[PDB]
Amino acid sequence: RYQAVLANLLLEEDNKFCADCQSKGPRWASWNIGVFICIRCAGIHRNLGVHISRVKSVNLDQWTQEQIQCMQEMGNGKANRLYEAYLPETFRRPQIDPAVEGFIRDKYEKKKYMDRSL
Ligand SMILES: [Zn+2]
């Protein structure tokens, strides 16, 4: 029902890369946060708990209109501005599982780098 809408959102340039690790062509999402993520980072989001992140597959899960709306109102661009506001420009974005797990908890659970005014 909503694959088309999701497809059009996956065309947005920021959404062509995982929000957390920037690997190309993410096919998963945290819909309450509003980010498109790769399957590995979706695995990490899942373990954060549903109080923090609620993870769906873009192509295997059924979506509600409100959940789609969540992605429309955020996405990886707007999410970077909120959750990575205070990320040093020097920062080396991690790539390996345990470093990525720390970075994702830091971003969404601890909110180390978040601009709270947003
Ligand atoms: Zn990722």
PDB file of C-alpha atoms and ligand atoms in Angstrom:
ATOM      1  CA  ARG A   1       0.000   0.000   0.000  1.00  0.00           C
ATOM      2  CA  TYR A   2       2.843   2.393   0.997  1.00  0.00           C
ATOM      3  CA  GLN A   3       5.875   0.913  -0.876  1.00  0.00           C
ATOM      4  CA  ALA A   4       5.627   3.779  -3.417  1.00  0.00           C
ATOM      5  CA  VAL A   5       5.700   6.482  -0.783  1.00  0.00           C
ATOM      6  CA  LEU A   6       8.662   4.769   0.863  1.00  0.00           C
ATOM      7  CA  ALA A   7      10.414   4.417  -2.494  1.00  0.00           C
ATOM      8  CA  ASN A   8      10.093   8.186  -3.094  1.00  0.00           C
ATOM      9  CA  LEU A   9      11.487   8.859   0.361  1.00  0.00           C
ATOM     10  CA  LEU A  10      14.429   6.456  -0.394  1.00  0.00           C
ATOM     11  CA  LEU A  11      15.259   8.734  -3.398  1.00  0.00           C
ATOM     12  CA  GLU A  12      16.052  11.614  -1.136  1.00  0.00           C
ATOM     13  CA  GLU A  13      19.891  11.916  -1.252  1.00  0.00           C
ATOM     14  CA  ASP A  14      20.426  11.741   2.558  1.00  0.00           C
ATOM     15  CA  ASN A  15      18.286   8.560   2.606  1.00  0.00           C
ATOM     16  CA  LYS A  16      20.587   6.728   0.186  1.00  0.00           C
ATOM     17  CA  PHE A  17      22.984   6.095   3.122  1.00  0.00           C
ATOM     18  CA  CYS A  18      22.528   4.598   6.563  1.00  0.00           C
ATOM     19  CA  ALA A  19      21.840   7.391   9.069  1.00  0.00           C
ATOM     20  CA  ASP A  20      24.328   5.956  11.550  1.00  0.00           C
ATOM     21  CA  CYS A  21      27.091   4.187   9.594  1.00  0.00           C
ATOM     22  CA  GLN A  22      26.422   5.707   6.051  1.00  0.00           C
ATOM     23  CA  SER A  23      26.545   2.406   4.225  1.00  0.00           C
ATOM     24  CA  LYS A  24      24.679   2.693   0.954  1.00  0.00           C
ATOM     25  CA  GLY A  25      21.054   1.840   0.273  1.00  0.00           C
ATOM     26  CA  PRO A  26      19.536   1.388   3.730  1.00  0.00           C
ATOM     27  CA  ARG A  27      16.349  -0.813   3.655  1.00  0.00           C
ATOM     28  CA  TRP A  28      15.354  -0.568   7.323  1.00  0.00           C
ATOM     29  CA  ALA A  29      14.083   2.202   9.547  1.00  0.00           C
ATOM     30  CA  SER A  30      13.599   3.436  13.024  1.00  0.00           C
ATOM     31  CA  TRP A  31      10.232   5.035  12.402  1.00  0.00           C
ATOM     32  CA  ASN A  32       9.736   6.757  15.785  1.00  0.00           C
ATOM     33  CA  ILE A  33      13.196   8.380  15.476  1.00  0.00           C
ATOM     34  CA  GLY A  34      12.634   8.878  11.677  1.00  0.00           C
ATOM     35  CA  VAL A  35      15.853   7.489  10.198  1.00  0.00           C
ATOM     36  CA  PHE A  36      16.562   5.023   7.437  1.00  0.00           C
ATOM     37  CA  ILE A  37      19.278   2.558   8.487  1.00  0.00           C
ATOM     38  CA  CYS A  38      21.010  -0.575   7.232  1.00  0.00           C
ATOM     39  CA  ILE A  39      20.152  -4.048   8.529  1.00  0.00           C
ATOM     40  CA  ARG A  40      23.195  -4.152  10.853  1.00  0.00           C
ATOM     41  CA  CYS A  41      22.313  -0.837  12.525  1.00  0.00           C
ATOM     42  CA  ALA A  42      18.616  -1.929  12.640  1.00  0.00           C
ATOM     43  CA  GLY A  43      19.933  -4.913  14.693  1.00  0.00           C
ATOM     44  CA  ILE A  44      21.562  -2.449  17.139  1.00  0.00           C
ATOM     45  CA  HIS A  45      18.428  -0.197  17.272  1.00  0.00           C
ATOM     46  CA  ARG A  46      16.387  -3.295  18.119  1.00  0.00           C
ATOM     47  CA  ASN A  47      18.569  -3.947  21.132  1.00  0.00           C
ATOM     48  CA  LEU A  48      18.214  -0.350  22.384  1.00  0.00           C
ATOM     49  CA  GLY A  49      14.577  -1.165  23.189  1.00  0.00           C
ATOM     50  CA  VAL A  50      11.242   0.138  21.884  1.00  0.00           C
ATOM     51  CA  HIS A  51      11.299   3.015  24.332  1.00  0.00           C
ATOM     52  CA  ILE A  52      14.178   4.387  22.198  1.00  0.00           C
ATOM     53  CA  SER A  53      13.728   2.915  18.701  1.00  0.00           C
ATOM     54  CA  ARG A  54      11.044   1.053  16.806  1.00  0.00           C
ATOM     55  CA  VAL A  55      12.490  -0.708  13.823  1.00  0.00           C
ATOM     56  CA  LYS A  56      10.774  -1.782  10.582  1.00  0.00           C
ATOM     57  CA  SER A  57      11.855  -3.174   7.227  1.00  0.00           C
ATOM     58  CA  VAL A  58      11.015  -0.939   4.295  1.00  0.00           C
ATOM     59  CA  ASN A  59      10.037  -3.938   2.144  1.00  0.00           C
ATOM     60  CA  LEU A  60       9.050  -6.745   4.530  1.00  0.00           C
ATOM     61  CA  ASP A  61       7.004  -4.858   7.124  1.00  0.00           C
ATOM     62  CA  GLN A  62       3.514  -3.391   6.804  1.00  0.00           C
ATOM     63  CA  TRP A  63       3.452   0.300   7.684  1.00  0.00           C
ATOM     64  CA  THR A  64       0.705   2.490   9.094  1.00  0.00           C
ATOM     65  CA  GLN A  65       0.028   5.947   7.583  1.00  0.00           C
ATOM     66  CA  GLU A  66       1.284   7.565  10.836  1.00  0.00           C
ATOM     67  CA  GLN A  67       4.575   5.622  10.720  1.00  0.00           C
ATOM     68  CA  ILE A  68       5.144   6.759   7.110  1.00  0.00           C
ATOM     69  CA  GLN A  69       4.338  10.314   8.253  1.00  0.00           C
ATOM     70  CA  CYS A  70       7.055   9.996  10.895  1.00  0.00           C
ATOM     71  CA  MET A  71       9.646   9.302   8.148  1.00  0.00           C
ATOM     72  CA  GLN A  72       8.286  12.160   5.999  1.00  0.00           C
ATOM     73  CA  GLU A  73       8.683  14.641   8.829  1.00  0.00           C
ATOM     74  CA  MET A  74      12.275  13.586   9.638  1.00  0.00           C
ATOM     75  CA  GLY A  75      14.549  11.502   7.470  1.00  0.00           C
ATOM     76  CA  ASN A  76      18.329  11.242   7.638  1.00  0.00           C
ATOM     77  CA  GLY A  77      19.021  14.896   6.781  1.00  0.00           C
ATOM     78  CA  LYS A  78      16.855  16.432   9.478  1.00  0.00           C
ATOM     79  CA  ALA A  79      17.834  13.676  11.933  1.00  0.00           C
ATOM     80  CA  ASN A  80      21.629  14.467  11.411  1.00  0.00           C
ATOM     81  CA  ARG A  81      20.897  18.131  12.264  1.00  0.00           C
ATOM     82  CA  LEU A  82      19.188  17.119  15.538  1.00  0.00           C
ATOM     83  CA  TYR A  83      21.114  14.091  16.797  1.00  0.00           C
ATOM     84  CA  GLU A  84      24.542  14.921  15.356  1.00  0.00           C
ATOM     85  CA  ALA A  85      24.483  18.712  15.931  1.00  0.00           C
ATOM     86  CA  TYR A  86      27.460  18.638  18.299  1.00  0.00           C
ATOM     87  CA  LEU A  87      29.390  15.891  16.585  1.00  0.00           C
ATOM     88  CA  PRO A  88      32.952  17.178  16.084  1.00  0.00           C
ATOM     89  CA  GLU A  89      33.678  17.872  12.357  1.00  0.00           C
ATOM     90  CA  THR A  90      36.883  15.906  12.941  1.00  0.00           C
ATOM     91  CA  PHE A  91      34.933  12.806  14.324  1.00  0.00           C
ATOM     92  CA  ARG A  92      35.702   9.537  12.515  1.00  0.00           C
ATOM     93  CA  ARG A  93      32.258   7.944  12.001  1.00  0.00           C
ATOM     94  CA  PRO A  94      32.543   4.312  13.059  1.00  0.00           C
ATOM     95  CA  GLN A  95      32.098   1.339  10.854  1.00  0.00           C
ATOM     96  CA  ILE A  96      32.670  -1.813  12.945  1.00  0.00           C
ATOM     97  CA  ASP A  97      29.881  -3.426  15.007  1.00  0.00           C
ATOM     98  CA  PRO A  98      30.961  -2.661  18.630  1.00  0.00           C
ATOM     99  CA  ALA A  99      32.044   0.945  17.826  1.00  0.00           C
ATOM    100  CA  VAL A 100      28.794   1.517  15.907  1.00  0.00           C
ATOM    101  CA  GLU A 101      26.824   0.079  18.838  1.00  0.00           C
ATOM    102  CA  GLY A 102      28.441   2.657  21.184  1.00  0.00           C
ATOM    103  CA  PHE A 103      27.880   5.482  18.706  1.00  0.00           C
ATOM    104  CA  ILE A 104      24.172   4.616  18.241  1.00  0.00           C
ATOM    105  CA  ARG A 105      23.561   4.407  22.029  1.00  0.00           C
ATOM    106  CA  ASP A 106      25.469   7.728  22.406  1.00  0.00           C
ATOM    107  CA  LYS A 107      23.284   9.338  19.660  1.00  0.00           C
ATOM    108  CA  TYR A 108      19.816   8.191  20.587  1.00  0.00           C
ATOM    109  CA  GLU A 109      19.880   6.946  24.198  1.00  0.00           C
ATOM    110  CA  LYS A 110      22.567   9.234  25.803  1.00  0.00           C
ATOM    111  CA  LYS A 111      21.969  12.022  23.200  1.00  0.00           C
ATOM    112  CA  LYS A 112      25.613  13.181  23.587  1.00  0.00           C
ATOM    113  CA  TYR A 113      25.564  15.199  20.397  1.00  0.00           C
ATOM    114  CA  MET A 114      21.969  16.406  20.277  1.00  0.00           C
ATOM    115  CA  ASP A 115      20.911  20.005  19.918  1.00  0.00           C
ATOM    116  CA  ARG A 116      18.251  20.085  22.609  1.00  0.00           C
ATOM    117  CA  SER A 117      16.625  23.357  21.325  1.00  0.00           C
ATOM    118  CA  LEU A 118      15.457  21.199  18.387  1.00  0.00           C
TER     119      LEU A 118
HETATM  120 ZN    ZN B   1      24.275   1.316   9.347  1.00  0.00          ZN
END
